[PDB]
Amino acid sequence: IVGGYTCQENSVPYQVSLNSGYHFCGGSLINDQWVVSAAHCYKSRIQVRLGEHNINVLEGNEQFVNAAKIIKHPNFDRKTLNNDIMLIKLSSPVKLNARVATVALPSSCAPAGTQCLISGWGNTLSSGVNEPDLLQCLDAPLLPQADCEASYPGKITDNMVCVGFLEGGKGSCQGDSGGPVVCNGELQGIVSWGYGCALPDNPDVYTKVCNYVDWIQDTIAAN
Amino acid sequence: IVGGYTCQENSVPYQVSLNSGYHFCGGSLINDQWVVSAAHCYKSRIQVRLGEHNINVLEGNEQFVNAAKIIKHPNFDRKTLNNDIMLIKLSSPVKLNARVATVALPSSCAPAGTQCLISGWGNTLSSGVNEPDLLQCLDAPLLPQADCEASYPGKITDNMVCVGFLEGGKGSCQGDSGGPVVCNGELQGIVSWGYGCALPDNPDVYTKVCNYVDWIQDTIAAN
Ligand SMILES: [Ca+2]
Numbered sequence: 084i085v086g087g088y089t090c091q092e093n094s095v096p097y098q099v100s101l102n103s104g105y106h107f108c109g110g111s112l113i114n115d116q117w118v119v120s121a122a123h124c125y126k127s128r129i130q131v132r133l134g135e136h137n138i139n140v141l142e143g144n145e146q147f148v149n150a151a152k153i154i155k156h157p158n159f160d161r162k163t164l165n166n167d168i169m170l171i172k173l174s175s176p177v178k179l180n181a182r183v184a185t186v187a188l189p190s191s192c193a194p195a196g197t198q199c200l201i202s203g204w205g206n207t208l209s210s211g212v213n214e215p216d217l218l219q220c221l222d223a224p225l226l227p228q229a230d231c232e233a234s235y236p237g238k239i240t241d242n243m244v245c246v247g248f249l250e251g252g253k254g255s256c257q258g259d260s261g262g263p264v265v266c267n268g269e270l271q272g273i274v275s276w277g278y279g280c281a282l283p284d285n286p287d288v289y290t291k292v293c294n295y296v297d298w299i300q301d302t303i304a305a306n
Numbered sequence: 307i308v309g310g311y312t313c314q315e316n317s318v319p320y321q322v323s324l325n326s327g328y329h330f331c332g333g334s335l336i337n338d339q340w341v342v343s344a345a346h347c348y349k350s351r352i353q354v355r356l357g358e359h360n361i362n363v364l365e366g367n368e369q370f371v372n373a374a375k376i377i378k379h380p381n382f383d384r385k386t387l388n389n390d391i392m393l394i395k396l397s398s399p400v401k402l403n404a405r406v407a408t409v410a411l412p413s414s415c416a417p418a419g420t421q422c423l424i425s426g427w428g429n430t431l432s433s434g435v436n437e438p439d440l441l442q443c444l445d446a447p448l449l450p451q452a453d454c455e456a457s458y459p460g461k462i463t464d465n466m467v468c469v470g471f472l473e474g475g476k477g478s479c480q481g482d483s484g485g486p487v488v489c490n491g492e493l494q495g496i497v498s499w500g501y502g503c504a505l506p507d508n509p510d511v512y513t514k515v516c517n518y519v520d521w522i523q524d525t526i527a528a529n
């Protein structure tokens with residue numbers, strides 16, 4: 084997260100870090116046994132870390148659990164990043180508490196102009212790389228589809244929404260991928276892709292969660 | 307390497323990739339049993355990969371060897387990046403050939419205006435991250451010390467040299483660290499740090515190898 088602020092500790096309780104020997108993607112806890120992330124974050128072995136604030140320091144609220152089942156959306160297109168959604172079933176249920184909590188699935192598609200919360204341990208620079216220790220937060224609005232499209236001529240599907248600032252300076256970056264976009268307490272997007280980081284005219288693109296609720300439910304039920 | 311070109315295969319034979327389960331730094335083969343890198347690339351276990359072109363594909367010329375002894379310069383300052391030089395003794399001597407060859411230590415400090423060759427598997431973007439598969443190359447000049455200093459007021463020591471373009475667009479980035487800066491066939495610098503990547507007014511900084519020859523020799527001899 085470029086140009087965000089440090090979240091208050093454990094203030095984003097559904098935020099998880101996907102770890103493969105290092106943090107590589109975020110995710111969201113949607114029930115005591117399941118995490119939703121980006122399909123582009125797939126790896127054959129993943130340790131899910133919940134209750135984190137400082138990814139490099141054991142603060143006492145961490146829960147570390149291995150991924151049992153990792154399910155990429157059957158129509159994920161690694162080329163367009165269309166259907167960039169994946170589900171992770173935890174090897175075991177976590178203890179839900181103050182610092183480890185679930186986030187609701189969306190009851191509807193949020194309108195353009197809604198203010199959402201984006202979080203992650205992703206790169207904090209507009210140029211070069213700086214990996215933060217503490218979880219970063221960013222308040223940003225949902226843009227109208229037409230600005231989305233204009234920005235990435237021919238690349239936006241209806242399973243994608245733009246979130247951000249057309250003027251630059253703030254945004255999601257590498258390492259924020261698969262993390263949450265929460266609006267009025269519901270998960271509206273999954274951090275997916277953008278061009279550069281925090282650059283003018285290049286908003287962030289998110290997987291539109293409101294398009295997969297069914298998919299999410301069925302999968303969880305069948306698995 | 308931002309704005310460089312793809313090296314001709316095995317055309318930079320002394321170039322090594324430092325691997326810890328993934329490429330994280332470059333280095334230079336200076337003899338059949340030793341690699342010079344950046345101290346900031348230290349890790350307690352490293353596999354050195356020589357004869358690479360495509361870091362993700364086994365092309366048939368690779369030599370993979372574990373690091374036996376990893377020696378950071380005793381005055382390395384993790385804060386200023388002063389003395390950012392490290393030596394790696396390979397668990398065993400490599401077979402020197404066409405694609406795996408050594409690069410000479412400098413007989414003298416190169417003058418400003420000399421054209422050097424920079425190579426690496428580092429990030430190729432000015433904003434955001436793109437890790438290349440093939441080794442990237444960049445021809446760039448050595449800048450006068452005064453431009454160096456002006457650029458990073460209070461941060462340059464005499465063990466540092468700037469290499470690059472004051473106008474931006476070309477440069478070393480994350481992942482090129484510890485790699486070579488070769489001028490007229492001799493190792494003149496080790497990729498060390500810069501602000502952003504490929505940005506105007508922010509040249510790259512390299513460890514000045516001509517200041518450590520003695521150190522290099524003694525170490526090799528004593529170890
Ligand atoms: Ca922690």
Ligand SMILES: [Ca+2]
Pocket residue numbers: 358359360361362363364365366368
């Ligand atoms: Ca290879």
